[PDB]
Design a protein around this nucleic acid. Structure first.
Lengths: 128, 100, 217, 204, 118, 87
RNA sequence: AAGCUGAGGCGAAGGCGUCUACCUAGAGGGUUUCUGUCGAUCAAGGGCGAGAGUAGGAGUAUCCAACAGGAUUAGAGACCCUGGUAGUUCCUACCUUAAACGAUGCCGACAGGAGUUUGUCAUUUGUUAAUGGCAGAAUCUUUGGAGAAAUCAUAGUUCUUGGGCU
C-alpha cells in the first residue's frame, strides 16, 4: 500500500541525484508539486512537467545536478517558531545552507520564509 | 558461514524432493543432492575378440549395459568421482571436458 | 648532491616551474615522491608518531614479531597526511611511515554562525568510516576548543580547526581504524557539494601540457 | 568527398553478441547472430580521435595490441612518432617509477579493452584518457571515445590505424594519396611472411 | 645436468654481440668464449660454449625467443619496410550482404557503384 | 566561499564533472582532463582547444563514452554520432 | 510408481510424479466488462501443519527402535553379519513439535548491465522461431552502494539517521 506520496517521491529523486541522471519520473499530487516549487525558487532543481492522464498524475523532473538529499519526514510534526530552531539543528547538516519545508498557514515555504511571515505549522521534510 | 550459495542442494522453489540410494553405502539421500549416466560394454574389450570367433551370426554388435548411478557425498568422495577443490574454482559449474 | 628527481612531477618542482600545493590538488595528480612535499611546505610540517603496535605471524619456529606504526604529517594551515607501515625494526617502521604520510596529503574549512573573519571549523558535518569505527565531525561555534579522543585531537590540531565537535561510534580501542576514519572524514569535506561551488569557472591548464617543452626541448 | 566506405566495407562488417554501451554504434542485428557495425559513425569518430591525438608532443603521447592482429600499432608509432610496447604490457607501468620503461603519457590508444583490461585499468591510477578500437563484444568501462570496429580478422585493425594516422597528418601539416598504402598496416602470419622472404631475393 | 641462470644469461649475451664469430662446432666456440669474455674457471666456459652450440642449431631454424643478434635486426628492417604494389583493397566490385546494403541506404550513400547480395 | 565583509577564502576549488556535475576531489586519480582541437572549416587547426572533464565515477560505469558524443555535438565538433539511429 | 526427472512446474507453508473417468480450488496472461477505496499489518481467537508418538478397528509383503544370536575388541550394552515384534499401509479420533532454514517477518517505491528459463499475449511468415510486453524461477558480472568480514540487485537508497504495521 502507498502510505505516503511526498515521502515516497523524494526518495526516487534522491536516487536519481546520487546516480547523476538528467531527468526522473515520479503518481503526482498538490503537496509534491509545491515541495518541488519551493526548491525551484532556491535553484536546487531545474524545471518540471506535471502531466495529465485523467488519473493520479505523473511528474517529469529535469535535474540540474546540484542536490544531495531530499528527505520527507513523517509523521507530520507540528512546529511553532520558538520551537523551530531545534528542528534546524537536528535535521540540516550545516547552519549556512539547506532549508526546511514546512506547510505554514499561508502555504508551504522554507524556514527562511516562515520566520519572515511569522507563521509556523506542520513540517514536510527538508533538502540540502 | 555459508559454504555454497546452493547449500549443496540443487532445488529452488520446492519444499520437498524424493530420495534415492548410493550404490555402496545404500544410504537414503535426496535426489536433488551426484548422478552419472554410465555406458559400459557388456563383454569387455580383450574378451571381445576371443568371443567373436565363436559367435553364431556374422559380424554382430555386442551390446552395451546402461546404468544411472546415484551416490551421496560420503560415497562419492571415497571413490574419487568427486573431490574437494580450491575456493575460487568451486564456482566452476562445468565438467572437465572442453570444446571449440 | 641531494635528491635527484625521478618522474615528471619531481622534475617540475626541482625546476620550480610549479609553485604551491593547490596546483597539484586541483589537477588531481598522484604524488609518488616524499621529496615533493618536503619542498613545497618546507618549513612548518611536523612528524608525529601516533603509536607503535606489536604484530605476530606464527611460524614453525615460534612467532616472527614485527612492529606496525603510524605517523601523521601536519602543517597547521589546513593540510594533513596519514601513513602506516610494518617492519621488523622499529626505526624502519617509523621512517617508513613518515614517508607514507607525505605521499598521501587539503582540508576544507568554514564558519559556524556568521562569516566573521578566517574560517575555523568543518563546513558541514561529515563522517568517515573505516572498518567498525565511525567518525563524525560536527560544526561548532567559535572559541569552543576541539573535543574528541586524544588520539583524534592530535590529528585534528594538525588539521588546524580552531574548534570542533565529535561523535565516535563502534570499537574505538582499535586505534589504526580510529585515526584512519578521522583522516577519511576530512577527505569527505571536499566531496560534499555546497551552494558555494556552483558556477563554472574556466578550467585551469594542466601543468604537464603547459610546460611540455621545458620538460623535453 | 570523401568516400572510404569502399575501403571500410571491403573487409569488416562482422561481430558477435553486443554490449550495452555499444548498442548506439551498431546497426541492425543480422540473421545468423552477427551484428552490423555502422560505417557512418566509425569514420566520423576517427575524425574526433585525430583531434584528441593532437597532443602537444607526439612522443609523450602513448599508443600501446596484446592481441596478435601488433604490426599496425608499430607503424602508427613510426609515422606519428608515438611510443609503443611490443610483447606483454608489464603492469605497474604508469605507476611504479622503479621499472626501467616508466612512461606516463598524456593520453593512450588501445587495440581492444576486452582482451586487455590491464593497461586500461592502470590508466585510472594516473589520470590517463583512453581511446579504444573495440568491436561489439567489448566492456566499455574506463574508456572514452570508442572506434567501432572488428578486432578478429587481420585486416580490420590495420585499416583503422592507417586511417587514424592519415587524419592526424592532415591536421598537423606535412601532408596535403600519400604513398604509404594500408597494405603496410596488416598483421602478417609467418606463412604470410614466407612469401616476403622470397620477394626480397627475387628483386636481386 | 641443467644449465643454470648465470651460464644461460651469459650465453645469450655472447650471441647478442658476437654472432659474427662462432659456428656449429663446440671446439671452436669454446676457444672463442675465452677471448670474448673473461671467465674464472675452465669448467664454466665448457658449459657456456655448450649452450652457445645448442642455440646455434636452434637458430638454423625459426627465430628464437628472447635473443637478438644484429644480422636479423638488419634483415627484419628490410622484410618490414617494403609494401606490395597496389592497394589490394579493390575488388573492385565489392560483394555485400542484403542487410548491409540496407545500412548503406540509411547512411545516404546507395548507388555507390559496389555490388549487392550474391 | 566568501568572507562576507569582502574577499574570497579557501584554497583551491575542485573542478566539476561535465557529465554528472559533481565535485572532483584531490585523490580520485581516475579523473580525466581532455584536450580537443577545434578546427577551421576545411579542417584547419586554429591553435585553440576545448578542455573536456570527467570524474572517476563516470568513467567507472562505462558512460564517459556517451558523454563525449553529447558534449562534443553541443560544442559543435561532430555531426551525426549523437542521436540516432539503431536500425 | 524406476528410467523421462532438470538449480523444471504447482501449493499458504507442511508438501505434491504410472494411466483413466469423476467432483473441487486458484495463480499468471488478455479485457474501450462492473463496483468505487471496499485496503495494509496484526494481542486475543480460529484452522492447516513432515517424521516420530497415542487410542480403537482393518491389514501385515518389504524394511525394521526393542530384543535374540554371530563376529570383532582389553571390554562392545555399538559400528559389520543372520533372524526379529511394535511401527512402516488404509479408516476414525488425538498430539501440535523439527536445521518447519533463504537460519533473511508482511505490504509499498525507486536504484545496472548481461544472457538463461516457465506461462501467456502482441507486431512480423526467423511461426516448436525472432524481437518486445507483463508474472514467475534461478544465474552471471571488470557495475554502484552496504557489511566486522564471509559475502548481498537485496543484506542498497541509514550520524546525508523518520513510507506503514507486527
Amino acid at each position: 500500500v502507498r502510505t505516503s506520496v511526498l515521502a515516497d517521491a523524494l526518495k526516487a529523486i534522491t536516487n536519481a541525484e546520487r546516480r547523476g541522471m538528467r531527468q526522473v519520473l515520479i503518481p503526482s499530487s498538490k503537496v509534491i508539486i509545491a515541495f518541488l516549487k519551493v526548491m525551484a525558487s532556491r535553484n536546487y532543481i531545474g524545471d518540471f512537467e506535471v502531466i495529465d492522464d485523467h488519473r493520479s498524475g505523473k511528474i517529469v523532473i529535469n535535474l540540474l545536478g546540484r542536490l544531495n538529499k531530499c528527505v520527507a519526514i513523517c509523521p507530520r510534526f507540528d512546529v511553532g517558531l520558538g520551537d523551530l530552531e531545534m528542528w534546524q539543528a537536528k535535521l540540516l547538516p550545516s547552519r549556512q545552507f539547506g532549508y526546511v519545508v514546512l506547510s505554514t498557514d499561508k502555504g508551504i515555504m522554507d524556514h527562511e520564509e516562515a520566520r519572515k511571515h511569522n507563521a509556523g505549522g506542520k513540517i514536510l521534510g527538508m533538502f540540502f | 558461514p555459508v559454504k555454497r550459495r546452493n547449500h549443496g542442494r540443487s532445488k529452488m522453489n520446492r519444499g520437498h524432493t524424493r530420495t534415492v540410494n548410493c550404490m555402496n553405502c545404500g544410504r537414503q539421500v535426496p535426489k536433488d543432492k551426484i548422478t552419472r549416466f554410465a555406458i559400459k560394454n557388456m563383454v569387455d574389450a580383450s574378451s571381445a575378440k576371443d568371443v567373436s570367433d565363436a559367435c553364431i551370426y556374422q559380424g554382430y554388435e555386442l551390446p552395451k549395459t546402461y546404468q544411472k548411478q546415484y551416490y551421496c557425498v560420503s560415497c562419492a568422495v571415497h571413490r574419487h568421482v568427486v573431490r574437494p577443490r580450491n575456493v575460487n574454482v568451486r564456482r566452476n559449474r562445468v565438467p572437465l571436458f572442453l570444446k571449440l | 648532491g641531494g635528491w635527484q628527481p625521478r618522474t615528471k612531477l619531481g622534475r617540475l618542482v626541482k625546476s620550480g616551474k610549479i609553485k604551491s600545493i593547490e596546483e597539484i590538488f586541483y589537477h588531481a595528480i598522484p604524488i609518488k615522491e616524499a621529496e615533493i612535499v618536503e619542498h613545497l611546505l618546507g618549513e612548518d610540517l611536523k612528524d608525529e608518531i601516533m603509536k607503535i603496535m606489536p604484530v605476530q605471524k606464527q611460524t614453525r619456529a615460534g612467532q616472527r614479531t614485527r612492529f606496525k606504526a603510524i605517523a601523521a604529517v601536519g602543517d597547521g594551515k589546513g593540510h594533513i597526511g596519514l601513513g602506516i607501515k610494518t617492519a621488523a625494526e622499529v626505526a624502519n617502521a617509523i621512517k617508513g611511515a613518515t614517508i607514507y604520510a607525505k605521499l598521501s596529503i587539503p582540508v576544507r574549512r568554514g564558519y559556524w554562525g556568521n562569516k566573521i573573519g578566517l574560517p575555523h571549523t568543518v563546513p558541514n558535518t561529515v563522517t568517515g568510516k573505516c572498518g567498525s569505527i565511525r567518525m563524525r565531525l560536527i560544526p561548532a561555534p567559535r572559541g569552543s576548543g576541539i573535543v574528541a579522543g586524544t588520539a583524534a585531537k592530535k590529528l585534528l590540531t594538525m588539521a588546524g580547526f580552531e574548534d570542533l565537535f565529535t561523535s565516535s561510534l563502534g570499537h574505538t580501542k582499535t586505534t589504526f581504524n580510529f585515526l584512519v576514519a578521522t583522516y577519511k572524514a576530512m577527505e569527505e569535506t571536499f566531496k560534499f557539494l555546497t551552494p558555494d561551488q556552483w558556477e563554472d569557472r574556466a578550467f585551469e591548464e594542466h601543468p604537464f601540457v603547459k610546460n611540455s617543452d621545458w620538460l623535453h626541448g | 568527398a570523401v568516400i572510404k566506405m569502399m575501403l571500410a566495407a571491403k573487409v569488416y562488417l562482422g561481430s558477435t553478441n553486443l554490449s550495452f554501451g555499444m548498442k548506439p554504434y551498431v546497426f541492425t542485428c543480422r540473421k545468423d547472430g552477427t551484428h552490423v557495425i555502422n560505417l557512418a559513425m566509425t569514420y566520423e569518430k576517427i575524425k574526433l580521435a585525430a583531434r584528441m591525438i593532437y597532443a602537444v608532443e607526439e612522443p609523450k603521447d602513448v599508443l600501446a595490441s596484446t592481441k596478435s592482429f601488433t604490426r599496425a600499432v608499430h607503424k602508427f608509432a613510426e609515422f606519428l612518432g608515438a611510443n609503443y610496447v611490443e610483447q606483454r604490457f608489464t603492469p605497474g607501468l604508469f605507476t611504479n617509477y622503479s621499472i626501467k620503461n616508466f612512461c606516463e603519457p598524456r593520453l593512450m590508444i588501445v587495440c581492444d579493452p576486452n582482451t586487455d583490461s590491464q593497461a586500461v585499468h592502470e590508466a585510472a591510477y594516473a589520470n590517463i584518457p583512453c581511446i579504444a578500437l573495440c568491436d561489439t563484444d567489448a566492456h566499455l568501462d574506463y574508456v572514452d571515445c570508442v572506434i567501432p570496429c572488428n578486432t578478429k580478422n587481420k585486416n580490420s585493425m590495420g585499416l583503422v590505424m592507417w586511417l587514424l594516422t592519415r587524419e592526424v597528418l592532415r591536421l598537423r601539416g606535412a601532408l596535403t594519396e600519400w604513398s604509404v598504402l594500408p597494405d603496410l598496416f596488416f598483421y602478417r602470419d609467418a606463412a604470410d611472411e614466407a612469401k616476403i622472404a622470397e620477394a626480397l631475393e627475387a628483386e636481386g | 645436468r641443467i644449465r643454470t641462470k648465470t651460464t644461460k644469461r651469459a650465453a645469450r649475451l655472447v650471441i647478442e654481440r658476437f654472432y659474427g664469430q662462432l659456428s656449429f662446432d663446440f671446439q671452436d666456440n669454446k676457444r672463442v668464449c675465452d677471448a670474448v669474455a673473461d671467465i674464472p674457471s675452465k669448467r664454466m666456459r665448457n658449459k657456456i660454449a655448450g649452450y652457445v652450440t645448442h642455440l646455434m642449431r636452434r637458430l638454423e631454424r625459426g627465430p628464437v625467443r628472447g635473443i637478438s643478434f644484429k644480422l636479423q635486426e638488419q634483415e627484419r628492417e628490410k622484410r618490414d619496410n617494403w609494401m606490395p604494389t597496389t592497394s589490394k583493397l579493390n575488388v573492385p566490385k565489392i560483394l555485400v550482404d542484403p542487410e548491409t546494403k540496407e545500412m548503406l541506404a540509411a547512411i545516404g550513400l546507395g548507388e555507390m557503384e559496389g555490388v549487392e547480395v550474391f | 566561499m566568501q568572507n562576507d565583509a569582502g574577499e574570497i577564502v579557501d584554497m583551491l576549488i575542485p573542478r566539476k564533472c561535465m557529465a554528472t556535475d559533481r565535485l572532483i576531489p584531490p585523490h580520485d586519480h581516475a579523473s580525466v582532463q581532455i584536450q580537443i582541437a577545434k578546427v577551421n572549416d576545411d579542417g584547419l587547426p586554429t591553435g585553440e582547444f576545448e578542455t573536456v572533464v570527467f570524474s572517476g565515477y563516470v568513467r567507472a560505469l562505462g558512460e564517459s563514452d556517451y558523454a563525449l558524443n553529447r558534449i562534443a555535438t553541443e560544442k559543435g565538433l561532430l555531426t551525426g554520432v549523437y542521436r540516432n539511429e539503431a536500425h
